[PDB]
Structures are given as C-alpha cells and as structure tokens.
Design a protein around this ligand. Structure first.
Ligand SMILES: *[C@@H]1O[C@H](CO[C@@H]2O[C@@H](C)[C@@H](O)[C@@H](O)[C@@H]2O)[C@@H](O[C@@H]2O[C@H](CO)[C@@H](O)[C@H](O)[C@H]2NC(C)=O)[C@H](O)[C@H]1NC(C)=O
Ligand SMILES: *[C@@H]1O[C@H](CO[C@@H]2O[C@@H](C)[C@@H](O)[C@@H](O)[C@@H]2O)[C@@H](O[C@@H]2O[C@H](CO)[C@@H](O)[C@H](O)[C@H]2NC(C)=O)[C@H](O)[C@H]1NC(C)=O
Ligand SMILES: *[C@@H]1O[C@H](CO[C@H]2O[C@@H](C)[C@@H](O)[C@@H](O)[C@@H]2O)[C@@H](O[C@@H]2O[C@H](CO)[C@@H](O)[C@H](O)[C@H]2NC(C)=O)[C@H](O)[C@H]1NC(C)=O
Ligand SMILES: *[C@@H]1O[C@H](CO[C@H]2O[C@@H](C)[C@@H](O)[C@@H](O)[C@@H]2O)[C@@H](O[C@@H]2O[C@H](CO)[C@@H](O)[C@H](O)[C@H]2NC(C)=O)[C@H](O)[C@H]1NC(C)=O
Ligand SMILES: *[C@@H]1O[C@H](CO[C@@H]2O[C@@H](C)[C@@H](O)[C@@H](O)[C@@H]2O)[C@@H](O)[C@H](O)[C@H]1NC(C)=O
Ligand SMILES: *[C@@H]1O[C@H](CO[C@@H]2O[C@@H](C)[C@@H](O)[C@@H](O)[C@@H]2O)[C@@H](O)[C@H](O)[C@H]1NC(C)=O
Ligand code: NAG
Ligand code: NAG
Ligand code: NAG
Ligand code: NAG
Ligand code: NAG
Ligand code: NAG
Ligand code: CL
Ligand code: CL
Ligand code: F
Ligand code: F
Ligand code: NA
Lengths: 527, 527
C-alpha cells in the first residue's frame, strides 16, 4: 500500500509490474477545482483540500472534445481518440515514480497534442511507466481544457480571457513544484516535453513569465508556437467567439452576457458548433487556440522570440521525416489511406486549395512553382509526395527550425533531431512514411516491451532515444555516453547541425530543408 | 605640325585649344583592314601598312547601324545617334594626348554602349580632349562593328563565328599595346572604361584570355556581361541568324552558303531586317550580341565568373539612380516624355508585358507583388516609379552588384558607386530623374567647360569624378586625396560599401537595393 501525503491531502497509488520490476502509479490526482457552472471559461481555481485518502488508481475523465470519426474501426486514427469518459470535470494529472521510491529524481512532464481541440494524458502512447522503470525519472502528465472550453477568448474579460487550457497546464506545473518532493521528485529538475500542440504549449511556457520558475528545461517534438496553426489572432478569436454565440443562440449586446449565456449551454452544444466558427477550415484547423491575452502571453510571441524575451535554458527540438502525410487523407482530393494515392497536377492544385483556403492565387502558384520543379523522372508519385512535403514543411518542420535558430541565437544550447524511422507496426499505408505522431511511442519506451512485436532494431532505437531524453532532462545534454554512439552536436545558427534518428546509422547532418524553409520562412509570410 | 611614326605608318594629328592649354588629337586612325566584301562577318584582319602621312584630322565613319527615330528634333534622343557617315568601312580609333607630349602617360580606352546594335566613338559626350588636358592621361576610343554586321553568329564557322565587334575592340587594344609608346603612352598602364554595352564589353575583356595582356584595369559604368540583355544564347543566335536569312531571301541548306548570300546583300537590307529576327522585342532588345563562340569566350561567362576564371586586377563599377526610366518611353503604355506619366495598375501590368514578353504570368505576378507593396500614401506616381525601378534593377543595378560581389570574392579590390546627380541641362522630363547614360558627360569632363552653362556645383562634381577615375587608372585607387574628400572604401562581399556621387554630400552607404536584388538575383532566374 503506497500513500503519499500531498499539500491538499493523502493519495493512494498502485503498484505496476514493469520489466521484472515495480513502478508506482498515481493516476487521476485532482489539481484544480472542477471548472463547472460559473467556472466554465475561467482560469482554473486552486483546490480546496481534503481529509481521507484520494484513490489515484485509475485514469480520470478526459476533457470535453470532438472525436475523430473519420475511420471507425481503424487503429491508426482511433488510437488518438480519448479512452476515458469525457467530462468538464477533467483537471487531473498522473504521476509515475520508480520503486523503490527515488530520493531526488528528475521529473519529466508530458503535455499532449491534438491541435488544442482534442487530446488526453491517458492514451497508451503516453504511458509513463516505462520511463520511470528504465530511467528512474518521475513522469507527470495532466489533462488540460481543449477547444472553446479551453481557449474561447473575449480578450481582457476575466469571464473568458483566453488561454485557460494553458493556465490548466501551468497550474499542474505549480502542483509539481509544491508536491513532487513528497513523491521523491526534484522540483529543481523538471523538464517539459510535448508533441505537436503539446510542443507548441511547451514553447509558450518558455515565453510565459508565470511559467519561468516552474520548470528547468524543454523538449519540443513536432511543434512550436511559431507554427502557422499555433496562435489565434485577437481578430480571429473575437470573430470566432461571436460566431459561436450566434450559432448557439447566445448573441447579446453585452459581452459578459454572451459568456453568461454560453455557460448555460450543454457542453455538447458547444462542441457541436466549434467546427462552424470559421467560414472554411483545413485538416489543420485550430479553431480555438492560444491568443495574446496580456496575461499568459504579454505580447505577440514572434516579437518575444525575435527579441530574446524567453526563459534562458537548454532545448531539445525535432521533427519527423513525413510530418505532412497524416493530414492529406482528411480532405485532399485523390488521397486515401487504402490506396497508393497517386494524384494528378490538378488534384495537387485542389489540395493546395484545401490546405491554403485563402491565400491568394499567386500564393498558391508560388507553392506550386517551388515544390513541382521535377528533377525529374516522372515518376507518378511526384505530386503525392510534393503535397505531403508542402504540408509538413509549412506546418511543422520550417517553424521548428526557425524556432531553434532564433532561440539558440540568445546563447543557449539547443539540440535538433530528424526522426526518420517508420514503426514496423504502423497501421497507415507505406506511402505515408514516417508520420506525425509516430515518434511518441519510441520516446515513451513502448518498443522496450518485448511482448509487443516491435523489431529488435526498434527496441534498440527506443532504448537509445529514451536514454538521450533522460540525459537531456537530468543533465541538459542528450548524449548516449556508453555504447560508442554518435555525439549529438549543439545546433547553432551558423551551420545548423542536427542528428538523424533511425535504426541503421545515426548521422550528423546540416541545414535541414534549407531551400524549402527559405521559401516558407523568408518569402511566404509576405504571401 | 605633329607627326607620329606608328608601326603601320606616319600619322598627322591636330592641335586643339582646351582650357588655355593644348591637346593633340589624332582622330580616325585605321586599326584594321576594312571589313568589306568577303571580310564581312569575319574577325578583323590586320592592317597592310602605308607610306606617306595619314591625316588623322577628323572623326572617321561610324559603323552601320539603325538609328533612334523615336523623337525627331529632340536632343535627348538625337545626342546618341551617329554624327559621322555610316559605312562598313568603320574600323578606326581616336587618340588624344596632352601637350607637351607626355613621357609615359596612363591610357584610358573608351568602349561605347548602344546595346551592341548602335554607337560611335565620335559622340560629343565621349570627347577625350578634356581628360587629356586636365589629367594628362592619353584617351583612346574605337569604332567597333554593331548589330548583325558585328555579332551575327553561326557558332564554330569562321565565316560568321560571332563576337566580331568584340574582336574589333580587342584589335584596337592590340594597336594600343604596339603603338601607344610612340605617342608618349604607357602600354603597361591601360584602363578600359565603357558604359552600358561598353561596360558589358569591358567585363568580357576581363573574361577573355586573348585580352588578358592588353590592359591593366577596368571601369564598368551601368553594365556588365551578367545583365540579362548582354549575352545571346547559342540557341537564340542560330534562330536569329536563320531568321535573318529567311527575311533576306538567303535561306540555304548549306550554312556557309547562307553567309555567302548575306555577304551579297546591301548593308541597308541587313539593317532593315534586324528588328524582325525575334518574334517579340523589348525597348532593351539586343538582337545580335555577344555569344559563347569558344574563341573570345571559352565557356558560359556566368560559369567563368562564379569559378574565378578572369583577369585578377582592380575594378571600378557603378550605376545611376534611375537606370530604368529612359526605356519606359519606348513602348510602355501611359508613358510620355511630354507629361508626368502617371500610370494606373493596369498600365503597370501592361508595361511588364512589354518588358518581360514571356516570362510566365506567374513571373510577371511575382514582379508585381515585390514592387507594388505600397508603403503607402497613394501617391499617384506609385506605379510610374515602380516600373522604372523594375526595369533599372533587373537590367542594370542588380547585375552590376552581383558582378562586383562575385569579382571581389576572388581577392581583388573593387570600388562601387551610385551616381545620383541629374544634369541641370537634361532635356528629358523631371520624372525620369537620374537617367541611364547621363553620368558619361561628367566622367568626360564636359562640365569643366565654363562656357557651357552647367552649374558651379556640376563643375566641382565633374572635376572630382575626373580625378577619381584618373587616380583609379593610374594607381588602382579612386581617391581624391587633396580636398578633404570622403575616402572611397573597397567593396567586399560582406558589407558591400559603396560611394554616392552627387553635388551636396558624398556618402558611404551599404547594401544597395538589398531587398530588390534578393528578388532578381536569388529568385527570378528560376522564373
Ligand atoms: C467572421 O465570421 C463571419 C460570419 O460567419 C458566418 O456565420 C457564423 C455564425 C458561422 O456560421 C460561419 O460559418 C459563417 O461563415 C464570416 O463571414 C462569412 O464570410 C464568407 C467568406 O468566405 C462569406 O461567404 C459568408 O457569406 C460570410 N457570412 C456572413 C454571415 O456574413 C467572416 O468570414 C469571418 N471573418 C474572418 C474569417 O476573418
Ligand atoms: C525562332 O524563329 C521562329 C520564326 O520566326 C518567324 O519568322 C522569322 C523569319 C521572323 O520574321 C520572325 O519575326 C517570325 O516570328 C519563331 O517562331 C514564331 O514564334 C511565334 C511565337 O511567339 C509564333 O506566333 C509564330 O507563328 C512563329 N513563326 C513561325 C514562322 O513559325 C520562334 O519563336 C523563334 N524562336 C525563339 C524566339 O526561341
Ligand atoms: C484512391 O481512393 C480515393 C478515395 O476514394 C475512394 O476510396 C477507394 C479506396 C474506394 O473505396 C472508392 O470507392 C472511394 O471513392 C480515390 O479518389 C476518388 O476518386 C473518384 C473517381 O471515381 C472521385 O469521384 C472521388 O471524389 C475521389 N475521392 C476523393 C476523396 O478524392 C482515388 O481515385 C483512388 N486512387 C487510386 C486508385 O490511385
Ligand atoms: C501622357 O501622354 C501619353 C502618350 O500619348 C500622348 O502623348 C501626349 C503628350 C499627347 O500628344 C497625346 O495626344 C498622345 O496620344 C498618354 O497615353 C495615351 O493615352 C491615350 C488615351 O487617349 C491612349 O489611347 C494612348 O494609347 C496612350 N499612348 C500610349 C503611348 O500609351 C497619357 O495618357 C498621357 N498621360 C497623362 C496626361 O498623364
Ligand atoms: C535535490 O537536488 C537539488 C539540486 O538539483 C540539481 O541542481 C539543480 C539546479 C538542477 O540543475 C537539477 O537538474 C539538479 O538535479 C538540491 O537543491 C536539493 O536539496 C535536492 N533534494 C534532496 C536531496 O532531497
Ligand atoms: C613606363 O612605366 C613603366 C612602369 O609602369 C608602371 O608599372 C606598371 C606595372 C603599371 O602598374 C603602371 O600603372 C605603372 O605606370 C616602365 O616599365 C616603362 O619602362 C616606362 N616607360 C618609359 C619611362 O618610357
Ligand atoms: C479506496 O480503495 C481502498 C481499497 O484498498 C478502500 O479501502 C477505500 O475504501 C477506497 N476509497 C474509496 C472507494 O473512496
Ligand atoms: C548499451 O549497451 C548495453 C549492453 O550492450 C545494452 O544492454 C543497452 O541497451 C545499451 N544502452 C542504451 C542506453 O542504449
Ligand atoms: C594632309 O593634310 C595636309 C595639310 O596640312 C596636306 O599637306 C596633305 O597633302 C594632306 N594629305 C591628304 C589630303 O591626303
Ligand atoms: C581641389 O581644390 C582646388 C583648390 O581649391 C580646386 O581648384 C580643384 O578643383 C580641386 N581638385 C579636385 C581634383 O577636385
Ligand atoms: C454589461 O452590463 C452588465 C449589467 O449587469 C454588466 O455585467 C457589465 O457591467 C457590462 N459588461 C461589460 C463587459 O462591461
Ligand atoms: C557545304 O558545301 C559547300 C560546297 O562548296 C562548302 O562550302 C562546305 O564544304 C559545306 N559547308 C559547311 C558548313 O561545311
Ligand atoms: Cl496549370
Ligand atoms: Cl489585378
Ligand atoms: F542512438
Ligand atoms: F568627390
Ligand atoms: Na515566389
């Protein structure tokens, strides 16, 4: 029986058998007042404290969210859907600790992705028990509000100020500062890690003065705030809040009255109308996302980054070889997970309309010109591959690289990876390659489980990744020092060295997507 | 009576009074066999030698060429038209020497512009008597063949090998090497200078192994071989030669027979058909220009420049503030030298069609996007100014800057100027500004003549320019060392310092047209 006394009460955890050893899991610890009734759309409020023992023995409710119903019965999409009941009562976190209890362990805090619209910490690919067992780190993950319930903004108004989901995260970081020593954790050694919107979130905690003293270091997998999907403008937010109001019968003259009306709606009515708050959307739409609220974010985050206004610490950042492919089957014509998706020039052009809904004709033409100078072959898969790269480069790779360049310019050590291994178990077709989201299982050590039918090369790759992430968290340096591994060099603005991650041979390379990112980064912000 | 014994015979010159002093002029010395009959389209042949005295007492015939008839009676255009009879018998040069005869004077050799289609050394703005008088340099200038008669190419065929006009120039440089000591000149101190196509020519002598030992240093005013108008492709040349053949009734199966037929045509029939050898032309058309002949030019000159295959010496290069404006009244809709030429967006778009006849729609749109981001005003002269800058930047400024960057990268001192003074006497309207061609009169010292109604500030500016050019020719360093002048810094690829030339204040500036040239240089060669 494992009982830990926290600041707000006692919690009971449970023992898990992992790799002939033991891990203690505390699943579903509350970290804030349930944001119900009048607390809907507000910043999370602190917890009241309890006598008796909270049983943290199962994963808690996931936050309200729409679900991916595109491919019922299909593991590739369904694996990302929530696996616990949905509820507004969802502000809970999970703690995995090694056994025996550690003395002063480094802490890894996971922040999930899902476009700020979806996600939960209870997914099987975020199970922190392997990391705890193998590296003797403590792993923490939290549920934070998503969609309108987490990000609705009527800027400056404390009834709906925006960024609530980010304040949920921040309050979980505070819980860790205050409570993790009780669990054998070192609050002075805390590394945030996250993927996609989780990685964007981690990058915003780097920018937020309120988050400064709540963590040590940061890991950004496939995401950063400067991605074009990551921050909603005040103009967009206002329009989208007002659209939601109109759609739910909540239009009012008085804005505080709008919010009052919205707090009376069933959460299901809110979810149902989220997709419609924009005239046109893309498979990458973030209808309700982070905004400049003058609280969590004091200024436009691009300005903050450019001018060095961020936490000075080490970062580990990376992307996957085929970031863009996953999104192509959610609306690009000619694409299907169930065939090789050879598309024509015309289909490619229609695809750009899907992903760049406007975007001038000139803008779309410039994309076409840059990405379809076939050298050369023809080569039926030309257009198919081009559209994937457009989407991955614009949305994930070039922003991650620009983030890393601009961050490192202020003197800190940054390390960049390019993940190029496709899971032997991937249920998506071969043409999709090394997909967005599919490094996560390697980071969390799932291929370390021999019962699981990953290859031996995958076990080795995962073990190596796990060691490098742990060494980054503990020591600020993502090396694997014992098995004559390639040294991961620091990424600097001149030279821009990065490390490739794959089963055959780890390589030091330079200037990832140099030509492509010159297009997106230097030219396309104008168009 | 002034008689000089040359390698090929005695020449008599004439005495000129200049600024209360004397200059000896030898106008119209032959330097090659007249390229008539069977010598038409061939490289120039050496001169036979003569007894008795050649009277070099007037300017010789100008080479056959079409004339600018756009504005009869108008000095601004007519000043560029030939002022001596046109003849195929035109291979003559001029020598001005100070009096008393110098002992070992530095030599400046002028190569005129005119798009390789027109020009003559006898123009009043190329009169070398002021330079000789004021700086005690020797000035030489030659007539070289222009148009088809100078540049017709059927590559590899000695009957019409291309580049004949460039070999004319080269043979005049040889004449100088062999003869200038007789006139008090130093063949080891020879500086080439030229403007527009003359400057492009100077840059090609830098690349030509045959010209290497024929000069010391080089000055490039408003031109360089990498300008888009400066070198004809082998494909274009062949098509244009064949088109000329078709147009003159000279189409044949045998190519040597084509040339034989062309040698029978009256030169007037050739001139008449030159404009038509291309389906569409621009006000900047160079129908018959330099080509890669494997003789004068051994490889594509861009490759030679990139890879450092050129004469290692100092260069002085520059451009005028409004290079592009002169061409706009030769076909852009809405433009007139006789009004302020306020054009609309649609007219601007039509203008691009005139100057970029194809050039995809995307290409033309990209130009529009880059040059019409009004910041901001509106501001009726927006489009008018934009089209001038497009034409000047693409055709003259960005190529001159890229030439200077690439040249200086191989270790030599380069000096770059930006000429921003508009002649008080300019007969063109004010909207045309600091025009192409209108620094030349300042270089040649015409404003030093007080009788001429230039301002006092212009006399001073000209005197300063003349000293800097002379110091560049004599010493490789374009300084004016005596009157507390701004030091002209070396232009280096990092930093890219240049000197502005104007009547108020000479400034050291950096990175001329940085944004515009990034567009033309990095992006537009693709489109
Ligand atoms: C801001 O919102 C307006 C209105 O959005 C419409 O009504 C909402 C309640 C919701 O149902 C949306 O899906 C509707 O589009 C947008 O105005 C629309 O713009 C499109 C242009 O693509 C136009 O064809 C529609 O007719 C407009 N609808 C109305 C009612 O005027 C507007 O585009 C949004 N502003 C943005 C995105 O900046
Ligand atoms: C190469 O030349 C051909 C033929 O040129 C035509 O005939 C010549 C004698 C002369 O009179 C030219 O002005 C004529 O254009 C070009 O073929 C023409 O191309 C245009 C496309 O703009 C087309 O509309 C015409 O019908 C074509 N004319 C013929 C007779 O076929 C061709 O464009 C040139 N190649 C180039 C510029 O690369
Ligand atoms: C790959 O499949 C796509 C997607 O749509 C199809 O999925 C197939 C697996 C099959 O079940 C089929 O019935 C289903 O429609 C194909 O694109 C479709 O092509 C048709 C032409 O008949 C269009 O009318 C559809 O709109 C279009 N769908 C989409 C979403 O664009 C695609 O042709 C196929 N590609 C191959 C075989 O290379
Ligand atoms: C400036 O003049 C141009 C050029 O053409 C005109 O020149 C004038 C000085 C005058 O002699 C006039 O008769 C002559 O046509 C004007 O552009 C012209 O505008 C007319 C509209 O009637 C068009 O039909 C012509 O095609 C067009 N010419 C060209 C070459 O494009 C221009 O409008 C005028 N601009 C002003 C006053 O701002
Ligand atoms: C736990 O260790 C603390 C020091 O942590 C280390 O130094 C900080 C600055 C970070 O770099 C972190 O990564 C390191 O692990 C001590 O202050 C603290 O007292 C320790 N607590 C114990 C032993 O109970
Ligand atoms: C003329 O002077 C010659 C040297 O010229 C100088 O050095 C060369 C290399 C160039 O740098 C040039 O600019 C200089 O002016 C002598 O070789 C030659 O003999 C002199 N001739 C005379 C005095 O009759
Ligand atoms: C928590 O679980 C333990 C089972 O060991 C039980 O004793 C206790 O009553 C539980 N508390 C609950 C369900 O509230
Ligand atoms: C390093 O090597 C050992 C022994 O060969 C192996 O068991 C382990 O998996 C490797 N460690 C890491 C961190 O990759
Ligand atoms: C050259 O000019 C002089 C005039 O001084 C004259 O003596 C001589 O005969 C002339 N030669 C000609 C015209 O061929
Ligand atoms: C320098 O100054 C003198 C005397 O003031 C003047 O006559 C001359 O024009 C100037 N020289 C140059 C080369 O500009
Ligand atoms: C609108 O008036 C109501 C009246 O109760 C009140 O909530 C508030 O003062 C007003 N709204 C705002 C946003 O100030
Ligand atoms: C074409 O034949 C003629 C026959 O006299 C001759 O000039 C030459 O050998 C041929 N042309 C070429 C270019 O070889
Ligand atoms: Cl098309
Ligand atoms: Cl338009
Ligand atoms: F590794
Ligand atoms: F000066
Ligand atoms: Na472009």
């Amino acid at each position: 029986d494992i009982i830990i006394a926290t600041k707000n009460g006692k919690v009971r955890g449970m023992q898990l058998t992992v790799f002939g050893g033991t891990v203690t899991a505390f699943l579903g610890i509350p970290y804030a007042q349930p944001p119900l009734g009048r607390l809907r759309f507000k910043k999370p409020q602190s917890l009241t404290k309890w006598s008796d023992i909270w049983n943290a023995t199962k994963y808690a409710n996931s936050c309200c969210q729409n679900i991916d119903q595109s491919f019922p019965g299909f593991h590739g999409s369904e694996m990302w859907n929530p696996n616990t009941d949905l509820s507004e009562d969802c502000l809970y976190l999970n703690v995995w600790i090694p056994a025996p209890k550690p003395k002063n362990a480094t802490v890894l805090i996971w922040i999930y992705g899902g476009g700020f619209q979806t996600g939960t910490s209870s997914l099987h690919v975020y199970d922190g028990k392997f990391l705890a067992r193998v590296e003797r780190v403590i792993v923490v993950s939290m549920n934070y509000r998503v969609g309108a319930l987490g990000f609705l903004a009527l800027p400056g108004n404390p009834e709906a100020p925006g960024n609530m989901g980010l304040f949920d995260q921040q309050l979980a970081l505070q819980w860790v500062q205050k409570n993790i020593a009780a669990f054998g954790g070192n609050p002075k050694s805390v590394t945030l890690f996250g993927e996609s919107a989780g990685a964007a979130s981690v990058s915003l905690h780097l920018l937020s003065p309120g988050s400064h003293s709540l963590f040590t270091r940061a890991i950004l997998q496939s995401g950063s705030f400067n991605a074009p999907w990551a921050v909603t403008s005040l103009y967009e937010a206002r329009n989208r809040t007002l659209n939601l109001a109109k759609l739910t019968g909540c239009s009012r003259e008085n804005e505080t009255e709008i919010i009052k009306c919205l707090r009376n709606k069933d959460p299901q009515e809110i979810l149902l109308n989220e997709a419609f708050v924009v005239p046109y959307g893309t498979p990458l739409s973030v209808n309700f996302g982070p905004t400049v609220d003058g609280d969590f974010l004091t200024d436009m985050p691009d300005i903050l980054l450019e001018l060095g206004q961020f936490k000075k610490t080490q970062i580990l950042v990376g992307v996957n070889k085929d970031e863009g492919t996953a999104f192509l089957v959610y609306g690009a014509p000619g694409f299907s997970k169930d065939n090789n998706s050879i598309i024509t020039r015309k289909e490619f052009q229609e695809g750009l309309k899907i992903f760049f809904p406007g975007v001038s004709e000139f803008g779309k033409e410039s994309i076409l010109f840059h990405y379809t100078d076939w050298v050369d072959d023809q080569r039926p898969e030309n257009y198919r591959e081009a559209l994937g790269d457009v989407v991955g480069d614009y949305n994930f790779i070039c922003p991650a690289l620009e983030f890393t360049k601009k961050f490192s310019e202020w003197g800190n050590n940054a390390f960049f990876y390019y993940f190029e291994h496709r899971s032997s178990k991937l249920p998506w077709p071969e043409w999709m390659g090394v997909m967005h989201g599919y490094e996560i299982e390697f980071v969390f050590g799932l291929p370390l489980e021999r019962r699981d039918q990953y290859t031996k090369a995958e076990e080795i790759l995962s073990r190596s990744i796990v060691k490098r992430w742990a060494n980054f968290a503990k020591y600020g340096n993502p090396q694997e020092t014992q098995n004559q591994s390639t040294s991961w060099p620091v990424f600097k603005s001149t030279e821009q060295k990065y490390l490739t991650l794959n089963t055959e041979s780890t390589r030091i390379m330079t200037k990832l997507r140099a030509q492509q990112c010159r297009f997106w980064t230097s030219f396309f912000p104008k168009v």
